[PDB]
Amino acid sequence: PRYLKGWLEDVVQLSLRRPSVRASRQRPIISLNERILEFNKRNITAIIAVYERKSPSGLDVERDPIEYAKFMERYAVGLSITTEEKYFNGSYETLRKIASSVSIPILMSDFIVKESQIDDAYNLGADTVLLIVKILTERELESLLEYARSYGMEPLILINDENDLDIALRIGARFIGIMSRDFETGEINKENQRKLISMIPSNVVKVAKLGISERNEIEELRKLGVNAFLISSSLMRNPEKIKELIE
Ligand SMILES: [Cl-]
């Protein structure tokens, strides 16, 4: 990985030593990026609903994961399940349980630094994984991208700034998420997010990552070319808000 400090360095240390699981996948790969385009074709707002109990940005919500997932199955284009344990209070068991109960695509959201975590994702039922440019070297990103693709996943490559974007396009990422915060400060910077979205080629599937969201913000981002929205806080606090955001 790359040089890091603060809590990011700690979480990467944890990921490096995270033990791999042995498990049989129970369902085929359901492609998240392909379902997004199908939603786009029919002009249905495509929202990836995040399940996470905690976040360093202050989220703290206890909520039945199955009740949430089965609700979201009726409206969301996919689910993102955070499996980082120390700062997001996620677990592999939660991913496995949700993956065995819904039939929409599942993004495993963690700090992936080694191939065995992608094995974990596949074995537990995820349909794709998140890769973060800021914690990986370019050569690591390229290797893990190819590794994920060998399983038939197209990973979501998460970018924060223009240097991230250059790396992402150089390695051939086809599915790119754009952050609205930066990791170290946590400060929201929506101007930078809109700036980056406009620099991405139109044939890349683009995902805007948001905590709090409103319909007018969604509409503006869609006009700028965003294909889908990865939304956490608004929906963890108020699942039913997804109806307003779509209609
Ligand atoms: Cl973000």
Side-chain angles (χ1 to χ4, degrees):
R2 281 178 198 181
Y3 191 79
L4 301 159
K5 53 188 187 177
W7 71 276
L8 274 181
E9 162 166 59
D10 187 45
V11 82
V12 164
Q13 191 167 68
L14 284 180
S15 298
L16 283 171
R17 56 179 216 245
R18 184 113 186 231
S20 64
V21 311
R22 305 295 181 273
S24 279
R25 188 187 180 87
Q26 303 299 341
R27 48 198 218 62
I29 293 279
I30 309 169
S31 163
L32 178 59
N33 56 315
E34 284 189 338
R35 193 163 193 241
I36 287 160
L37 296 168
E38 181 69 20
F39 271 46
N40 295 160
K41 169 184 172 190
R42 301 192 214 184
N43 205 34
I44 302 156
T45 301
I47 294 186
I48 311 163
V50 174
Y51 180 83
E52 62 186 21
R53 298 175 180 93
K54 266 172 188 173
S55 78
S57 61
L59 186 62
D60 188 337
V61 175
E62 302 194 35
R63 162 185 308 287
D64 188 334
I66 300 307
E67 188 197 65
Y68 182 78
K70 286 189 155 157
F71 175 78
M72 290 297 173
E73 184 173 30
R74 308 160 194 290
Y75 299 104
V77 75
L79 282 167
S80 176
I81 309 304
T82 302
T83 50
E84 197 290 313
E85 296 180 289
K86 181 173 187 179
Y87 298 92
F88 294 84
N89 279 18
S91 72
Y92 278 165
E93 179 60 12
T94 303
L95 168 62
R96 187 215 292 273
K97 284 152 75 166
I98 284 163
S100 303
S101 310
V102 300
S103 58
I104 59 165
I106 295 172
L107 166 70
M108 178 175 114
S109 180
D110 208 323
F111 293 75
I112 294 184
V113 291
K114 60 183 177 173
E115 287 174 358
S116 74
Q117 289 171 277
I118 296 174
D119 297 337
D120 292 347
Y122 184 81
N123 289 342
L124 295 164
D127 302 294
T128 186
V129 298
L130 184 75
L131 295 177
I132 301 167
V133 180
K134 270 266 181 295
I135 75 180
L136 298 168
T137 73
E138 174 163 331
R139 300 215 327 283
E140 289 170 335
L141 189 63
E142 194 173 64
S143 179
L144 295 167
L145 174 61
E146 291 167 356
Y147 194 78
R149 282 172 176 171
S150 74
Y151 273 106
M153 307 174 171
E154 184 61 28
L156 183 64
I157 296 188
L158 194 64
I159 64 165
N160 198 65
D161 64 23
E162 199 163 349
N163 192 43
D164 290 351
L165 179 59
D166 286 329
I167 300 171
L169 297 178
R170 249 210 306 289
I171 60 170
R174 289 190 278 267
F175 192 22
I176 292 179
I178 304 95
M179 302 181 68
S180 58
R181 309 171 164 262
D182 61 3
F183 293 101
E184 70 292 2
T185 53
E187 282 181 325
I188 294 154
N189 187 357
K190 293 187 177 183
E191 187 273 344
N192 178 65
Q193 180 178 57
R194 291 190 298 274
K195 179 176 74 182
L196 291 174
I197 290 157
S198 297
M199 303 179 55
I200 297 164
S202 68
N203 66 314
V204 171
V205 179
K206 301 167 273 294
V207 180
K209 190 182 168 54
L210 307 166
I212 305 294
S213 55
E214 299 294 355
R215 175 74 201 165
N216 65 333
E217 185 192 29
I218 296 307
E219 285 181 16
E220 175 180 38
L221 294 171
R222 188 82 186 99
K223 298 174 214 148
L224 298 181
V226 172
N227 301 86
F229 306 88
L230 181 61
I231 299 169
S232 51
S233 308
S234 285
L235 300 182
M236 279 300 301
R237 288 176 185 141
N238 183 10
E240 296 95 311
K241 183 166 196 182
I242 193 167
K243 296 175 159 177
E244 296 186 279
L245 295 181
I246 291 175
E247 305 159 4

Tab-separated table of all heavy atoms in Angstrom, residues 10 25 27 30 41 46 49 69 111 130 140 143 146 160 171 173 184 206 234 246:
chain	number	residue	atom	x	y	z
A	10	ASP	N	-4.091	2.801	10.437
A	10	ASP	CA	-4.528	1.754	11.350
A	10	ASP	C	-5.423	0.752	10.632
A	10	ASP	O	-5.237	-0.465	10.744
A	10	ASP	CB	-5.251	2.396	12.538
A	10	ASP	CG	-5.601	1.395	13.618
A	10	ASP	OD1	-4.728	0.567	13.962
A	10	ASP	OD2	-6.726	1.469	14.133
A	25	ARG	N	-19.704	-20.041	-2.497
A	25	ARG	CA	-20.645	-19.051	-2.982
A	25	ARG	C	-21.961	-19.709	-3.382
A	25	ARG	O	-21.978	-20.751	-4.043
A	25	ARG	CB	-20.044	-18.316	-4.159
A	25	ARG	CG	-20.869	-17.189	-4.568
A	25	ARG	CD	-20.325	-16.603	-5.815
A	25	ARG	NE	-21.148	-15.479	-6.207
A	25	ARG	CZ	-20.972	-14.246	-5.774
A	25	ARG	NH1	-19.965	-13.934	-4.980
A	25	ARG	NH2	-21.825	-13.303	-6.157
A	27	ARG	N	-24.694	-18.151	-4.998
A	27	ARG	CA	-25.421	-17.546	-6.102
A	27	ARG	C	-24.421	-17.076	-7.141
A	27	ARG	O	-23.242	-16.885	-6.827
A	27	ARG	CB	-26.292	-16.378	-5.624
A	27	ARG	CG	-25.615	-15.360	-4.701
A	27	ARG	CD	-26.710	-14.575	-3.980
A	27	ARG	NE	-26.469	-13.151	-3.768
A	27	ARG	CZ	-26.313	-12.252	-4.733
A	27	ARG	NH1	-26.076	-12.607	-5.988
A	27	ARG	NH2	-26.395	-10.961	-4.431
A	30	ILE	N	-24.078	-11.211	-9.915
A	30	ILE	CA	-25.044	-10.296	-10.516
A	30	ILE	C	-24.358	-8.947	-10.672
A	30	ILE	O	-23.973	-8.320	-9.677
A	30	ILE	CB	-26.322	-10.164	-9.678
A	30	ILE	CG1	-26.900	-11.538	-9.347
A	30	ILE	CG2	-27.358	-9.346	-10.439
A	30	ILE	CD1	-28.010	-11.478	-8.309
A	41	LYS	N	-31.209	3.337	-18.727
A	41	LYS	CA	-31.985	3.159	-19.949
A	41	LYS	C	-33.465	3.430	-19.716
A	41	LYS	O	-34.139	4.024	-20.563
A	41	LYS	CB	-31.765	1.734	-20.477
A	41	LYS	CG	-32.687	1.275	-21.595
A	41	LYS	CD	-32.402	-0.196	-21.925
A	41	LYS	CE	-33.430	-0.761	-22.899
A	41	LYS	NZ	-33.322	-2.241	-23.060
A	46	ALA	N	-30.858	5.498	-9.994
A	46	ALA	CA	-30.145	4.302	-9.563
A	46	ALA	C	-29.383	4.617	-8.278
A	46	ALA	O	-28.376	5.334	-8.301
A	46	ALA	CB	-29.194	3.822	-10.654
A	49	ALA	N	-27.773	1.534	-1.935
A	49	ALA	CA	-28.015	1.823	-0.528
A	49	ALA	C	-26.909	1.204	0.313
A	49	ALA	O	-26.584	0.027	0.152
A	49	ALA	CB	-29.373	1.303	-0.082
A	69	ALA	N	-32.212	-4.569	4.227
A	69	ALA	CA	-31.874	-5.090	2.907
A	69	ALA	C	-33.125	-5.484	2.134
A	69	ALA	O	-33.252	-5.182	0.940
A	69	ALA	CB	-30.929	-6.279	3.042
A	111	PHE	N	-11.490	-1.834	3.056
A	111	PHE	CA	-10.184	-1.305	2.677
A	111	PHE	C	-9.370	-2.485	2.171
A	111	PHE	O	-8.694	-3.168	2.937
A	111	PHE	CB	-9.556	-0.596	3.847
A	111	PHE	CG	-10.286	0.641	4.220
A	111	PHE	CD1	-11.493	0.566	4.885
A	111	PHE	CD2	-9.794	1.884	3.849
A	111	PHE	CE1	-12.196	1.704	5.212
A	111	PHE	CE2	-10.490	3.030	4.178
A	111	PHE	CZ	-11.691	2.934	4.856
A	130	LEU	N	-15.030	-2.743	-3.622
A	130	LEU	CA	-14.526	-1.381	-3.682
A	130	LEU	C	-13.005	-1.392	-3.626
A	130	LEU	O	-12.415	-2.060	-2.771
A	130	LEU	CB	-15.067	-0.571	-2.511
A	130	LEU	CG	-14.750	0.913	-2.403
A	130	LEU	CD1	-15.593	1.649	-3.406
A	130	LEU	CD2	-15.023	1.346	-0.974
A	140	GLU	N	-0.306	-1.974	-7.429
A	140	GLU	CA	-1.231	-2.777	-6.631
A	140	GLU	C	-2.646	-2.671	-7.185
A	140	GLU	O	-3.349	-3.676	-7.336
A	140	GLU	CB	-1.198	-2.329	-5.170
A	140	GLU	CG	0.082	-2.682	-4.425
A	140	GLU	CD	0.168	-2.022	-3.062
A	140	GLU	OE1	-0.472	-0.963	-2.857
A	140	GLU	OE2	0.883	-2.556	-2.190
A	143	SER	N	-3.028	-4.707	-10.305
A	143	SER	CA	-3.026	-6.141	-10.033
A	143	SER	C	-4.341	-6.592	-9.399
A	143	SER	O	-4.885	-7.643	-9.762
A	143	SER	CB	-1.833	-6.490	-9.130
A	143	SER	OG	-1.781	-7.861	-8.802
A	146	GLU	N	-7.197	-6.531	-12.084
A	146	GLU	CA	-7.174	-7.729	-12.920
A	146	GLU	C	-7.645	-8.953	-12.144
A	146	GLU	O	-8.371	-9.800	-12.680
A	146	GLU	CB	-5.767	-7.957	-13.477
A	146	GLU	CG	-5.318	-6.921	-14.505
A	146	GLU	CD	-3.827	-6.975	-14.800
A	146	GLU	OE1	-3.111	-7.762	-14.146
A	146	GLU	OE2	-3.370	-6.217	-15.679
A	160	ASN	N	-10.658	10.510	-5.176
A	160	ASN	CA	-10.782	11.653	-4.293
A	160	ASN	C	-10.318	12.949	-4.930
A	160	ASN	O	-10.764	14.018	-4.509
A	160	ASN	CB	-9.958	11.406	-3.017
A	160	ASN	CG	-10.349	12.307	-1.891
A	160	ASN	OD1	-11.466	12.224	-1.382
A	160	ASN	ND2	-9.432	13.172	-1.478
A	171	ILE	N	-5.165	2.886	-15.765
A	171	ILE	CA	-5.236	1.435	-15.616
A	171	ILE	C	-6.466	0.843	-16.279
A	171	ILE	O	-6.607	-0.387	-16.311
A	171	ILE	CB	-5.217	0.984	-14.142
A	171	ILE	CG1	-6.403	1.567	-13.372
A	171	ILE	CG2	-3.902	1.379	-13.480
A	171	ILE	CD1	-6.560	0.964	-11.994
A	173	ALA	N	-9.891	1.623	-15.537
A	173	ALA	CA	-11.099	1.488	-14.736
A	173	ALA	C	-12.322	1.832	-15.579
A	173	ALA	O	-12.313	2.794	-16.349
A	173	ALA	CB	-11.030	2.399	-13.508
A	184	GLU	N	-8.755	12.327	5.294
A	184	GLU	CA	-7.951	12.735	6.439
A	184	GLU	C	-8.667	13.793	7.266
A	184	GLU	O	-8.674	13.722	8.501
A	184	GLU	CB	-6.586	13.234	5.958
A	184	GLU	CG	-6.596	14.568	5.220
A	184	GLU	CD	-7.280	14.516	3.866
A	184	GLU	OE1	-7.799	13.445	3.488
A	184	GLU	OE2	-7.307	15.557	3.180
A	206	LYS	N	-20.231	6.136	-13.704
A	206	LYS	CA	-19.832	7.062	-12.652
A	206	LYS	C	-20.813	6.989	-11.490
A	206	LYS	O	-22.033	7.003	-11.698
A	206	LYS	CB	-19.767	8.499	-13.189
A	206	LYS	CG	-18.795	8.696	-14.337
A	206	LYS	CD	-19.015	10.041	-15.031
A	206	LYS	CE	-20.079	9.951	-16.132
A	206	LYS	NZ	-19.644	9.077	-17.273
A	234	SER	N	-28.230	9.370	4.966
A	234	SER	CA	-29.652	9.669	4.795
A	234	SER	C	-30.501	8.408	4.886
A	234	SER	O	-31.588	8.417	5.475
A	234	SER	CB	-29.905	10.354	3.451
A	234	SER	OG	-29.499	11.704	3.454
A	246	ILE	N	-36.099	8.813	-5.498
A	246	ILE	CA	-36.285	8.176	-6.794
A	246	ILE	C	-37.396	8.849	-7.587
A	246	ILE	O	-37.229	9.160	-8.769
A	246	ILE	CB	-36.564	6.670	-6.593
A	246	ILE	CG1	-35.301	5.970	-6.083
A	246	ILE	CG2	-37.037	6.030	-7.879
A	246	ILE	CD1	-35.498	4.502	-5.744
